[PDB]
Amino acid sequence: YQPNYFLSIPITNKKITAGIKVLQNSILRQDNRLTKAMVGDGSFHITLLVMQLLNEDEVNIGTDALLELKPFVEEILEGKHLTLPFHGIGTFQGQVGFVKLADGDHVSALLEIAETAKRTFQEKGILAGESRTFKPHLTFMKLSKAPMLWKKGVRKIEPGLYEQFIDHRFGEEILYQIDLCSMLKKKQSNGYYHCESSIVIGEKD
Ligand SMILES: Nc1ccn([C@H]2O[C@@H](COP(=O)(O)O)[C@@H](O)[C@H]2O)c(=O)n1
Numbered sequence: 001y002q003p004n005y006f007l008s009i010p011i012t013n014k015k016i017t018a019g020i021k022v023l024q025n026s027i028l029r030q031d032n033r034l035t036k037a038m039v040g041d042g043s044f045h046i047t048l049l050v051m052q053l054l055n056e057d058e059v060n061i062g063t064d065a066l067l068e069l070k071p072f073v074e075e076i077l078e079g080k081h082l083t084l085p086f087h088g089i090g091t092f093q094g095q096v097g098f099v100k101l102a103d104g105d106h107v108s109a110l111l112e113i114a115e116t117a118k119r120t121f122q123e124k125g126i127l128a129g130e131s132r133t134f135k136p137h138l139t140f141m142k143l144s145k146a147p148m149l150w151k152k153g154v155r156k157i158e159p160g161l162y163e164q165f166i167d168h169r170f171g172e173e174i175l176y177q178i179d180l181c182s183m184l185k186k187k188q189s190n191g192y193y194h195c196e197s198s199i200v201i202g203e204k205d
Contacts, residue, residue: 003050007117008179011044015171016086020140027161036146039139042191046136049117051128063197065124066180070199072116081202082106082175086138089166094156098137099170110136175201
C-alpha cells in the first residue's frame with residue numbers, strides 16, 4: 001500500500017543539520033544539477049513508521065494512537081534516553097543518499113519502538129507499517145525528487161561527490177520528539193513537514 005502519513009523523529013541537533021548543509025553544498029559545487037534532489041532545510045528526520053490516513057476521523061484516530069504510544073516508548077527505554085549517532089554516508093542503490101545511524105544498542109531499541117508503533121496503530125484500525133525490513137536512515141537527497149535528472153545525464157549519485165564525508169561524524173541526536181506528519185500537505189514555513197500532532201520523549205512530565 002501507498003502511505004500518505006508517517007511517524008517522524010525530527011533531527012534538529014544543530015551540529016547534525018549543519019554538517020549535512022556542508023555535505024549538500026559540497027555536492028552542489030561539484031554538480032549543480034543535483035539541487036532539486038536535495039532534501040530541504042528544516043526537513044531532516046528519521047521515519048519511524050508509515051501509514052494510511054484517508055479522512056479527518058482516521059487522522060484524529062492517528063493522533064490518539066500517537067498519544068498512546070508515548071508511555072510504550074518510555075518502557076522500552078527503561079527510564080533512560082535514546083542516543084542516535086549519525087556517522088558516515090550510505091545509499092539505497094545510488095538513488096537515495098543518507099547519513100547512516102551508527103551501530104549500537106540504540107539500534108534494537110529503535111526497531112522495538114518502530115514495531116510497537118505499528119501494533120499500536122493497527123489496533124486502532126490504521127493500516128501502518130511495511131513488509132520491507134526497517135533500516136533507519138537520515139536522508140539528505142533522493143533522485144526521485146528531481147524526475148528530470150533521470151531524463152538528463154544523471155541516473156545515480158556519484159560516490160566521488162561525497163567521498164570526503166564517508167567516515168564523517170555528523171553528531172548525536174537524543175530522541176526528544178515524535179511527530180505525526182503528512183507526506184503530501186504543504187510544508188511548514190520552517191521547512192518541516194505538515195505536523196498533525198506530536199509527543200515529547202526524554203523529559204520530565
Ligand atoms: N529500506 C528502505 C527504507 C526507505 N527507503 C526510502 O528512501 C526514502 C527516502 O527516505 P525518507 O523519506 O525516510 O527520508 C523513501 O523515499 C524510500 O524510497 C528505501 O529505499 N529503502
